[PDB]
Design a protein around this ligand. Sequence first.
Ligand code: A1CMV
Ligand code: CLR
Ligand code: CLR
Ligand code: VSN
Lengths: 337, 350, 286, 54
Amino acid sequence: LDQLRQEAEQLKNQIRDARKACADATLSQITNNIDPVGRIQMRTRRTLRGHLAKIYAMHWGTDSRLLVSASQDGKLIIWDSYTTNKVHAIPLRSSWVMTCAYAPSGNYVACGGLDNICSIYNLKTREGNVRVSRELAGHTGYLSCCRFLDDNQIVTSSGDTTCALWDIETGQQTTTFTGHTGDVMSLSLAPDTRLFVSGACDASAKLWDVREGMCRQTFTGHESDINAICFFPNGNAFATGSDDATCRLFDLRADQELMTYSHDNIICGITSVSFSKSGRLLLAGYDDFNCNVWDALKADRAGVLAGHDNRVSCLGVTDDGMAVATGSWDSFLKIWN
Amino acid sequence: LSAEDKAAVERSKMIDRNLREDGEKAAREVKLLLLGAGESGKSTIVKQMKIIHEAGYSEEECKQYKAVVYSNTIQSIIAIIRAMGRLKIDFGDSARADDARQLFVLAGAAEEGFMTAELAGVIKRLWKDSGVQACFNRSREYQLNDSAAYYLNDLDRIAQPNYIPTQQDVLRTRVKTTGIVETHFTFKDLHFKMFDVGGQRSERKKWIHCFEGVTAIIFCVALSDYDLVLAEDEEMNRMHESMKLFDSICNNKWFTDTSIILFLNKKDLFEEKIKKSPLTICYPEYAGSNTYEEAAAYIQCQFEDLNKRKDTKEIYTHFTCATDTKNVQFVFDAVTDVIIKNNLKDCGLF
Amino acid sequence: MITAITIMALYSIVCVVGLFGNFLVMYVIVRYTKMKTATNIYIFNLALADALATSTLPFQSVNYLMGTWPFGTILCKIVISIDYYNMFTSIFTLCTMSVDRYIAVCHPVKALDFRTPRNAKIINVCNWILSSAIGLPVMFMATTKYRQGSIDCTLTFSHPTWYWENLLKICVFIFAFIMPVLIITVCYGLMILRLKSVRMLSGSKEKDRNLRRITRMVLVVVAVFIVCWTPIHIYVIIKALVTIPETTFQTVSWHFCIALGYTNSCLNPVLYAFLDENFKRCFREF
Amino acid sequence: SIAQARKLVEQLKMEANIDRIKVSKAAADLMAYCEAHAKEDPLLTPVPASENPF
Ligand SMILES: CN(C)C(=O)C(CCN1CCC(O)(c2ccc(Cl)cc2)CC1)(c1ccccc1)c1ccccc1
Ligand SMILES: CC(C)CCC[C@@H](C)[C@H]1CC[C@H]2[C@@H]3CC=C4C[C@@H](O)CC[C@]4(C)[C@H]3CC[C@]12C
Ligand SMILES: CC(C)CCC[C@@H](C)[C@H]1CC[C@H]2[C@@H]3CC=C4C[C@@H](O)CC[C@]4(C)[C@H]3CC[C@]12C
Ligand SMILES: Nc1nc2c(ncn2[C@@H]2O[C@H](COP(=O)(O)OP(O)(O)=S)[C@@H](O)[C@H]2O)c(=O)[nH]1
């Protein structure tokens, strides 16, 4: 009963000093010979207007042209980033939406929120407009993230402390990813789609296995709710943004902290992180009406993306690395280059 | 520039037109959020508002609500029988003890809402006992549903799960849906949007900013919970935890100026419980008399003194029974005041 | 001598401060705040009416300076048309702003489903159209008349000269002074009574002080309208009623009343725009 | 309770026996990936107006 905890503590100590014994250097000590990015300035090329309520999430497209955005007005607007157009506007059965997704093939769009149901939508119906294809029920908490593995599967985060892996056609949870001790906030999917990390309220990020279905690693270090998560482009690292006014880069191989991205005169939280194509830029959408541009190798601010009249809540970089999208609570999306 | 993609521009224009129409239709309404403690009467309040305004209920909806009724009767009789094992109240005779034994046996194997007539007879013979009525009277020493008398006084003689229950049965029973519950009704050219957080036992902080922009917060406080206690540590009060929950809601950063429609529910139980049990069980420093008016005003003034911004944020404390026609009129008056304030916020007036 | 320079000085100062106030309102309402609300569109169109109505003040002042109109018949036609049109527009937009505030207060749900920005747009368009419906006969009817070589321009009428004079005077009295002030007084009186009856404006010191602030600014609006429009209309009516001998004090008083009306149109934007809490909120951030 | 603690202990045992390469080689690999794709990154090296679709 109580004999298990006193040796779980020494197992934790074994993990901690095994990570400490494998930390002969840091990321910053061997990146000093790299010339810095400098002070890069990005301009708002497109100002996607048309929402009315606070946008909470957006997801890009694999073709790097279309994107989707979810807002409290109850609409899933599918934009056209090049021409500032709107190709679809899906009405939601429940207006309380906290996340949205987009298919790697571009055929489907997911959403979910306080109704605890992940609604999949089919954009290529020949019978007419976009209608609900499948409603994935089975979560007892609010859906907070959802990523399509492909047209067949989805990996969803929820506030019931458990993640999920739904087969869409059967509409059932094939695999459940439990192990956290807090409400799970956001999950990022690996480029090879075989693993995925997820942050939660317990200030920990867990790297799971998509096929096998177990937790492989647990990363600590934050002091508050981890709101955002994003894989590094090679799949061997990831960056988490938390409410403790800092971002941290972890490592799937060294299995410990790599670098913190903190700055003085910053107290607001981070709700979105996203990497560039080369991974040199870590874009973090803060809560002080801005979206700071960080360097993932020198841990210095190379820029800032101001122009939003409320809290930036969601980011995104296209698959070809061309642009940066930035939603906010001021009912506006923006594109940067 | 007169290209092939002009169809895309026309589609975007019609999408913008329809979306603007939907947005103005949404902005021509009023949105309210329900908050309160456990079993305070919020769902019954909005069910009454929906019944008197929108419509009744469907056949299949009444079917799952009768399933909820059967689950509620089973849970209530299980609690009221197992309360004797801790409160030490003996049965009238050995026949009722055998009836309780077979009730435990039947509750150990549950399939659906079949409601065998033997089980109904067991319920009837158990409820027709002096000890069970005594523990029903002494039920303030533990937890019990406030509609258990309604189930065990009228729904005992149902005899078959073959026909839909009455609207009163649906009104007093709520589902265990963990998701958010949204009800719509129209009262004098306003479209009300009640947002009951049914279940949602998840940190109360990652979606409390989703409601920054609601018109008002209909808080609910059970008046009959001043003498009841919680069977988890036996060191806290239900009224006191309702008070601190109201204090945490009122001091929230997202509801700095959001008006509160404070409903003090279950006055029909408070007025009949304050005759026997004094209010001094809840507040040990209460000095007034044990009358309904003074005690109710005392609870109201404590809940209003929880507010720290009384000069700008208004609280509408109304004593309600959750089965009243004036219940929606109180809400209408409060939201009309808030709409007047919002229409005064622009034009440089307020 | 002294009278000429005093009249020139007063017209010049009221024109420059009216143009300065209206253009400050213009720059603020196109750069700091936007016209996404109904009251901002009303303030913008009132600023247009007041700016274009006082833009013809230097022409009248130089007309009094030389006693002649060397500009021509076409320029005096457009000056007369602009003056009448952009004064009627200002009066009617004051009327519809008062109606808007009364609808916002006393009829809350009607203010929800009626006060869309597009509805304010169509109200302003109908306002300018209804002002043009009376400003265009004035365009067709005004002309340059020859009087002892001073070519002073005055509105000449049809063969029943006195009947058209009386018709124009009664139409500018009862449809631009009597009905506007009656509408303003009844709308603001009902608004003040409803704001007295409402719960969150009474029962405390701060709420009573707030209600005092709204009542004070409303009474300031009505008082300045009365004190700056009564001398003009009463003076015009009694001039049309009894003959007045020509003297220095008569012309000085006539031009002073004219200056009072133009001072009303001058201080209207500093009284509506710069007293708004929306403007204070958007300006204190700078 | 007991089963939950046993499951947590088994999970920590599964988390402790995995292999962990050095931080130096992983940081060098991240540096190599960054310098091997910095040529193709548009945000790092923005084309003025030629290949901008925006
Ligand atoms: C009609 N009445 C009694 C007015 O008071 C008047 C306009 C009177 N208008 C002024 C210009 C004028 O002097 C003139 C002569 C020749 C030229 Cl070339 C150019 C201008 C001719 C007379 C007004 C409003 C405000 C301040 C002062 C006067 C007004 C009232 C209501 C609606 C429209 C106009
Ligand atoms: C010389 C002048 C006085 C002649 C008459 C000018 C007319 C045509 C002008 C003056 C005021 C103008 C309006 C002022 C304000 C707005 C709001 C803006 O969002 C759209 C145009 C709109 C609705 C304008 C339409 C045209 C308008 C009515
Ligand atoms: C007197 C107070 C209370 C109110 C004043 C406002 C009105 C009634 C005033 C303003 C200007 C005034 C006029 C100014 C000058 C003259 C010329 C004089 O030879 C006779 C009186 C007469 C024609 C005045 C009549 C009254 C008048 C029209
Ligand atoms: N006799 C009587 N019963 C009342 C009254 N008010 C409320 N109740 C009952 O109290 C229980 C909890 O209600 P509810 O489901 O909303 O709880 P909750 O949403 O907080 S979880 C419901 O069964 C209500 O019939 C009243 O005046 N008289």
